[PDB]
A paper describes a structure:
Lysine benzoylation (Kbz) is a recently discovered post-translational modification associated with active transcription. In addition, we demonstrate that a subset of YEATS domains and bromodomains serve as Kbz readers, and structural analyses reveal how YEATS and bromodomains recognize Kbz marks.
There are 15 bromodomains in S. cerevisiae, and we purified four of these bromodomains and characterized their binding abilities with H3K14bz and H3K27bz peptides. Although most bromodomains showed negligible H3K14bz or H3K27bz binding abilities, the Bromodomain from Sth1 (Sth1BD), the ATPase subunit in the Remodel the Structure of Chromatin (RSC) complex, surprisingly exhibited robust interaction with H3K14bz (Kd = 89 μM), albeit weaker than that with H3K14ac (Kd = 16 μM)36 Fig. 6 Sth1 bromodomain has Kbz binding activity. To reveal how Sth1BD recognizes Kbz, we determined the crystal structure of Sth1BD in the complex with the H3K14bz peptide at a resolution of 1.4 Å. The H3 peptide is well ordered, as evidenced by good electron density from T6 to Y23. Histone H3 sits on the acidic apical region of the Sth1BD helical bundle and makes extensive contacts with the ZA-loop, BC-loop, αZ′, αA′, αB, and αC of Sth1BD. The indistinguishable configurations of the Kbz- and Kac-binding pockets indicate that the acylation-binding pocket of Sth1BD intrinsically has adequate space to accommodate the large benzene ring without any structural rearrangement. The Sth1BD-H3K14bz structure clearly shows that the acylation-binding pocket of Sth1 has adequate space to accommodate the large benzene ring without any structural rearrangement of Sth1BD. This indicates that although most bromodomains have small acyl-binding pockets suitable for short acetyl marks, certain bromodomains can bind diverse acylation marks other than acetylation.
Numbering used by the authors:
A (entry chain B): 6 to 23
B (entry chain A): 1249 to 1358
Write the structure that this text describes.
């Protein structure tokens, strides 16, 4: 899959409560 | 130099695995750990951080002396990517594609 334009990661939403 | 020459060649082969659309090396995101500034929770969420630069350094400094250690470090690195990132995201896909490549590499070298 093409790299995200910023080069940034894709952190899962559920980790906000980890 | 221990296993460092063998690992340097493996990493070069990994870096030659490019995305079919934009040609980015699938190793790109794995070369170094995320910045704590950009991802403040990364080091809270990921218990055993790992990246390619760390793997190479550990083969140079004698921390990893066996391919088994390198295989476990790569497995952890890819598991960290799959745990942290959304399924189907570019990082997740690169982790899966590279992990399939390294699985075959280890088979051929075992």
């Amino acid at each position: 899959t093409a790299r995200k334009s910023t080069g940034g990661k894709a952190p899962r939403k559920q980790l906000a409560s980890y | 130099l221990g296993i460092f020459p063998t690992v340097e060649k493996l990493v070069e082969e990994m870096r030659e695995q490019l995305d079919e659309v934009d040609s980015h090396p699938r190793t790109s995101i794995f070369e170094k750990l995320p910045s704590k500034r950009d991802y403040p929770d990364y080091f809270k969420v990921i218990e055993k951080p790992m990246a390619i630069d760390i793997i190479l350094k550990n083969c140079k400094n004698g921390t990893y002396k066996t391919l088994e250690e390198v295989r476990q470090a790569l497995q952890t690195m890819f598991e960290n990517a799959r745990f942290y990132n959304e399924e189907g995201s570019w990082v997740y896909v690169d982790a899966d594609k590279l992990n399939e490549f390294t699985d075959e590499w280890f088979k051929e070298h075992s």
